[PDB]
Design a protein around this ligand. Sequence first.
Ligand SMILES: COc1ccc(-c2ocnc2C(=O)NCc2ccncc2)cc1
Lengths: 344, 23
Amino acid sequence: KVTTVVATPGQGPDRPQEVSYTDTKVIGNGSFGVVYQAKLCDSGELVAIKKVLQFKNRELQIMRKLDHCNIVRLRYFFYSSKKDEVYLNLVLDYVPETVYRVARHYSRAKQTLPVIYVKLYMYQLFRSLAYIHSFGICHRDIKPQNLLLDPDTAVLKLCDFGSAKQLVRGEPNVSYICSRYYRAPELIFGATDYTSSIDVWSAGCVLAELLLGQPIFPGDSGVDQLVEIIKVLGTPTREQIREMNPNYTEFKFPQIKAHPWTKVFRPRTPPEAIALCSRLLEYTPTARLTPLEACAHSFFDELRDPNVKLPNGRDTPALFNFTTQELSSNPPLATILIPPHARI
Amino acid sequence: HRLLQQLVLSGNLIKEAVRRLHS
Ligand SMILES: COc1ccc(-c2ocnc2C(=O)NCc2ccncc2)cc1
């Protein structure tokens, strides 16, 4: 069946137009709603359609603002029909794979993801985070399942803005957010005044998971999530508790020292990957690297080499096409992030 | 979670997590 709908372009203008698609199939179903795969009749291009029961949709208002090579682009949006039931459909660029599926493959085969892919995926993830954080947008669901991949080009695109929120200081936010294994400790402590640094904690969990071949903090519950963190970071200090949640107080508790980072990972783990990870998985939210600072980390130096290639021999995807928006947290950093061979 | 809410309200979260380390 060929489906014809009146849809509005994702970025501009607000001029609705007829869009026709075919080859419709369910590719995902969850609490959020349903995700379909379809083919646009006009260009033969593949699309993902995220259908949500729908007040204005927070996810749509965020998606309409974004245009970045490491973020799944919102091509169109259309409403469909109890009949009081209204569904919002987000027509997104299609991406065939996820970091979850790719990492699972290597894990099942008992082999580590090659270091070049760890650098490429993590660098693209930090770029997508530098971009959204510059608008005050926090994703709040950074996990391998939300990291889409083009297996041939090694392009990574951040998806699923269903948990995302534009954070405003002094306006409270829900603490029970983010998939458990990737949940920042300040969220476990019940913080409602947290910042976009919760996404950097989650990005550090993805990195460690890529180095280990399994999640670093596999909590079996909310409390067990903190147990898993303490096994690595030890107990937080009174000052770190205040930095995580100033509303939380605990006068007495047994002090546990951190486990050495070098023993958390397998012996052959690249020491620069461990160093980077130690600067992301910190109790103090403000001590975590910003995404732009993480892109400039020496672990990503191989990506800035002019002779760098994928193991399949293809060239690396676009890594240096930075915009003023993306560089806004620290504009002078541009001269370090954009190597001489990449400049016009 | 209902247990977590309780530990956060009672200020016993770290103590209980340390106990669960088993210990
Ligand atoms: C929950 O919100 C979502 C938002 C966007 C997407 C999405 O957007 C573009 N592609 C996808 C996608 O999932 N491709 C990977 C895939 C392909 C084929 N079978 C399974 C997985 C998925 C979920």
